[PDB]
Design a protein around this ligand. Sequence first.
Ligand code: B4P
Ligand code: B4P
Ligand code: B4P
Ligand code: MG
Ligand code: MG
Ligand code: MG
Lengths: 85, 401, 401
Amino acid sequence: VDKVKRSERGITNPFFLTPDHQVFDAEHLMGKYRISGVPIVNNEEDQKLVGIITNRDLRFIADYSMKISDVMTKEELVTASVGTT
Amino acid sequence: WESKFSKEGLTFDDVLLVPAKSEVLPRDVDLSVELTKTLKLNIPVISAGMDTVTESAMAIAMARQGGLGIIHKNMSIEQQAEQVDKVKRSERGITNPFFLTPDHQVFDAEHLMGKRISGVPIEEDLVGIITNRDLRFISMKISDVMTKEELVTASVGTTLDEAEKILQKHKIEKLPLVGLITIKDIEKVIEFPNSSKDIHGRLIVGAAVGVTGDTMTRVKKLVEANVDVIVIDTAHGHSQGVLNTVTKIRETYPELNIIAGNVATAEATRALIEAGADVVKVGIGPICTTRVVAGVGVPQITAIYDCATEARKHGKTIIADGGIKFSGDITKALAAGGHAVMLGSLLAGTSESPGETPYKGPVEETVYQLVGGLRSGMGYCGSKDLRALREEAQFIRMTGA
Amino acid sequence: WESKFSKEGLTFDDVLLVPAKSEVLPRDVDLSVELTKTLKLNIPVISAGMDTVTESAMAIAMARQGGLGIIHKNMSIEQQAEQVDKVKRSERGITNPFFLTPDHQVFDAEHLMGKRISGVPIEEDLVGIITNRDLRFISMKISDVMTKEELVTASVGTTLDEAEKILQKHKIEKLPLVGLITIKDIEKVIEFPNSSKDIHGRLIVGAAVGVTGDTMTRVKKLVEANVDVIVIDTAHGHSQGVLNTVTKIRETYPELNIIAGNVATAEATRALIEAGADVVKVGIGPICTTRVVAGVGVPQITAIYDCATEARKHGKTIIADGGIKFSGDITKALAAGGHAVMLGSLLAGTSESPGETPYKGPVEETVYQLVGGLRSGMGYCGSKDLRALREEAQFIRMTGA
Ligand SMILES: Nc1ncnc2c1ncn2[C@@H]1O[C@H](COP(=O)(O)OP(=O)(O)OP(=O)(O)OP(=O)(O)OC[C@H]2O[C@@H](n3cnc4c(N)ncnc43)[C@H](O)[C@@H]2O)[C@@H](O)[C@H]1O
Ligand SMILES: Nc1ncnc2c1ncn2[C@@H]1O[C@H](COP(=O)(O)OP(=O)(O)OP(=O)(O)OP(=O)(O)OC[C@H]2O[C@@H](n3cnc4c(N)ncnc43)[C@H](O)[C@@H]2O)[C@@H](O)[C@H]1O
Ligand SMILES: Nc1ncnc2c1ncn2[C@@H]1O[C@H](COP(=O)(O)OP(=O)(O)OP(=O)(O)OP(=O)(O)OC[C@H]2O[C@@H](n3cnc4c(N)ncnc43)[C@H](O)[C@@H]2O)[C@@H](O)[C@H]1O
Ligand SMILES: [Mg+2]
Ligand SMILES: [Mg+2]
Ligand SMILES: [Mg+2]
C-alpha cells in the first residue's frame, strides 16, 4: 500500500555529480537506475548547476575517465525555473 | 564403348577429412587465396552471380569480409556497370547525398530515410539538416522546422582526422561538405581489416557475363567500370561458343581476369585454360535439374579434384561452385583442390541479398559460421594455410553405414 | 595429392562378427582388462569425463561393477580432488556423518534425509538418534522427542564383525561410533565382488584434465588425492600442445597412469605413446558436429583397428570413445582391438548421473544389459576372454541390403 501511495512523488531530490568525478562515475548512476541524465553542480553544498551529462554524450567518447567537465554540455545549457508548467 | 562405365565419382557425403598433426590453432589459420596475380582474397568465399544473391550490397559486404561478390547479369549493361562502379567507389568515407528543400514535408524525409540513412541535408543551385533524432521531437508537418541555425559544415578536402573530431566536438554524427562524411562512414573504414582490395585499395568486385550477342559490349562497359574479374558463366563451358568467347575477350583485354563457365572434367578445364581463362569454375549437376532432366552430372568432390589436378599443371585456379550445404563441405571442397568456393543458396536470404522477397539476417552471420567451420577443419588437419589443406590433407572414403 | 582419397573407413553398421567354435558359455566369459600394470578393470566399461555423466556417485557405481569412472573437469581443482578422494575412501564401511542438536525440529531432519540417508545422530563438543521409522509415529514438532534413552553405541575401532551383530542383537540398523557404521554400509562391502580396486583395496577412479594454464596444478592436487589415472582429454590429441602436456606430466609423475585425448590414426597414436601416454583414447567424429561443422571424421571401427594395431606394437592400450549405441557395438568395438569402451550418452540419464535435470533408472540396469550383450557376443565368437575377442574374432563386411 505504501509503495503505491509513494509512487507519484512529483524528482525534488535530483541525483547529481561534480566536475571532479570521472566519467565512470556517471555511467554508474545511469546504468544503476536506468537514468539517461546526470545534472552536474559546482559543489556538494552550494548545489549550483554547471553542466549536464547524458548517454548520447557517452557515445561520443571512447571509454575514458577524463574529468566530466571536459566531457559535459556547458555552453548552450537549458534550464527552467521551479514552478514552470 | 568399353570405357563407357569405367569412371567412378565421389560427392561430399562419401568422404571425410582425416586429422593430422597440428601445430596451429583454428584462429591462427591463414585463409588467404591468390586466384590470379591481380585477384587475391583473404577468405575463400565468393557470392554467386545470381539475381537472388549478389548486387552491389552483397559485393561490398563480401569484399569487406575478405571475399568476393559477382554482380549478376539479370540487368542491363548500364545497370551492371553502375553496380560495379558502386562497389569500387565504396569505403572512401559521399559526393552525391540525398537532398531536400525547405518546401518539402517531414513525411518526405522519413520515407527517404526508411528506404536506411539517418540524415538528409537541406535547390539546383545548404540551408539545414534533418536527422532521425530531430524526428523524435515532432506530425509530418513541414521540413522547414529543421536544424537551420546551428549548422556545422566542413570544406571539401577535409580529412577524416579533420573529422571524428569536428563531429566529437559538436557532438554531431553528420558533416556536410559545402558532399557528406558521416561517422559510420569513418568507422567502417576501420571495422574491416581483412577487406580484399585491388592494388589501389578499392574493394574488388566481379561481374557475370554470358555468351550472347552483346556480351562484348557488356564486358566493355564493365571493364570501363574498373571491374576486377569477369565471370563468363554458362551451363556448359566445354561448348565451342564459350571457348570462342573466352578467347575473344582474352585477345581484346589481355590482362583482364577471367573466370570461365561450369565444367567438371580435366579435359574441359584444359580447354578453358587454353582458350584464355584464368580461373575455371567447377560444377555440373553437383537430385538437381541437370540430373533429373538431362541425366548429366559429376559428383562434386571428383569434379573438384580432377579439375584442380589439370588446372595446377598450368598454374591456374579452380572455383568450387556447387552443392555446399554445411561449413564442413567448404573444408572438403577446398581440401579436394578448390581454391575458393562459390555460394548462392546459402546467402540468398540474407539482408544484403537482392529484394525483400526466407530471412537469414546479415550475411556476416552466415559467413562467420561457415568460415568458423573451415578454420576448425584446418585445425584438425594441421593446415597452416590454404595450400596445405589443398596439397596435403587426406580424405577417408565412407560407406553411406 | 594422389593418395588424397586412397583410404577406406568402416563404422559399426558396416560389419558383423562371425560365429566361431565355442567351448565357453556367455556367463563363464572373463571380462577383465589390464589397461596398465596399475589400472585393471573387471568389466571393459568406462564412464566418460562429462559433467552430465560422471561425478563421485557414478565413479563409485562404475568401480563397484568392475569398471571405471572419470571425474569431469567442469569444476574447480579443489572440488575435483574432493570427488576423487570421495571415491578412494568409499567402501570402508563414516567418520563425518550428518548431525543435529536437540534444538532443531523434525522438519530439519526429514529434509536432510530427503537430500537419501535414513538416520541422523543427535553441538561442537551424542545425545540421541533419529531415523525414518521414528518419523512414522510423528507433525514436524521438535527433534528432542527422538530415541534418547535406549542408545546403542560402539567404540571407535569396533570391527564390522563387531557389528552385523550388535545391530542384529538390538535389532537396529545404525551404530554410532563415539563416527557411523550402518547396516547398508556392512552389506555393500560384500555385494560387489567384481569391484575394480587398486593394490590397497580402494576403488579406482580417474580424473579429467585439459590443456590449460592450471592443469599442472590440477594434476598435482588430483595426484595428491590418490587418483589412479589422469585423462588428458582434448578434441585433437595430435596437436603439439597435447603432446607437450603429456610429456611434462610424464616427466613430473613417471609412474602416474595417463590416458590421452581423442585421436583416430596410427600416426597420432604413436605420437601420444612417444610423448608418454599409457592409454590412447580413440574417437574423432565417430552426423555429429565435427563432421557437419569441420568436415573431419574417421569411421570408428577403422579408427579402433588402426590405433589398436599401432598401440600394441608398443605394448599399450586403446580406449574406444565414440558412437556406441547398442550392446552389440561394444562387442564390435572390443573385437576391433579396443581394450575398453567409454560411454557417456548411454549413462547420462541414470540415477548416479549428475543433477536431476531422460531418467534411465540405476546405472546398474544399463551396464547389466550392455555387459549381457557383450557376453552373448563372446559366446558366439568362442571368445575365452578379452584378448581372444581382440586378437582372433573375425568380422564380415555388409552392404547397407
Ligand atoms: N538525476 C536524476 N534523478 C532522478 N531521476 C532521474 C535523474 N535523471 C533521470 N531521472 C529519471 O530517469 C528518466 C530519464 O531518462 P529517460 O527519460 O528514460 O531517457 P530518455 O530521455 O528517453 O533518453 P535518451 O537516451 O533518448 O536521451 P539523451 O541521452 O539523448 O539525452 C538528451 C540529449 O539532450 C542533451 N541535453 C539534455 N539536457 C540538456 C540541457 N539542459 N542542455 C543542453 N543539452 C541537453 C543531451 O546532451 C543529450 O544529447 C526519468 O524517469 C527521469 O525522471
Ligand atoms: N544524405 C545521405 N546521402 C548518402 N548517404 C547517406 C546520407 N545520409 C546517410 N547516408 C549513409 O547512411 C549511413 C548510415 O549512417 P548514419 O545514418 O549516419 O547512422 P549513425 O551514424 O548511426 O547515425 P544516428 O542514427 O545515430 O544519428 P542520430 O539522428 O541519432 O544523430 C544525428 C544528430 O546529428 C545532429 N546534426 C547533424 N548535422 C548537424 C548540424 N549540421 N548541426 C547540428 N546538429 C547536427 C542532429 O541534430 C542529430 O541530433 C552513413 O554511413 C552514410 O553512408
Ligand atoms: N548420518 C549419516 N552420515 C553419513 N552417511 C549416512 C548417515 N546416515 C546414513 N548414511 C548413509 O546412508 C546409507 C543408506 O543406509 P540407511 O540409510 O541406513 O538405510 P537402511 O539400512 O536400509 O535403513 P532403514 O531405512 O531400513 O532404517 P529404519 O529407519 O527402517 O530402521 C532404523 C531403526 O534403527 C533404530 N535405531 C538406530 N539407532 C538406534 C539406537 N542407538 N538405539 C535404538 N534404536 C536405534 C531406529 O529407532 C529405527 O527403528 C548408509 O549406508 C550410510 O552410508
Ligand atoms: Mg537520445
Ligand atoms: Mg540514435
Ligand atoms: Mg524400513
